[PDB]
Amino acid sequence: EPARVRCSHLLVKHSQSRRPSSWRQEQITRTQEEALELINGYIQKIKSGEEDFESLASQFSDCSSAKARGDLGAFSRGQMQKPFEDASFALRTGEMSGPVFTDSGIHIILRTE
């Protein structure tokens, strides 16, 4: 484990998310079920090669890191919500997580460093 990792992510918020708004939608109205369905659909297109993670995140992530194509930059432990932190540090660089759940919503994570 390095001191810090660098990750990008794709966040799909839902109406029960901690902050149910985003840069792309004044009010998040989708259900958590719908959010996980979207996340999984994203996972399958990225595995098939039909979509690129970073392009997907720059257009559809509910995180304002969309403008950075998903990049969150480097972080250490104790900074992010623990479920996000644990998944991130468990990835090898170049590896992509499965669905990851935080109070913010549902994420796909790509570790870059």
Ligand SMILES: O=C(N[C@H](C/C=C/c1ccccc1)C(=O)O)c1ccc2ccccc2c1
């Ligand atoms: O809270 C953020 N985004 C919120 C969404 C939650 C994002 C989030 C990220 C990691 C763990 C838990 C939640 C928003 O935009 O509404 C957030 C956090 C760290 C960032 C670092 C770099 C660039 C953008 C960033 C955006």
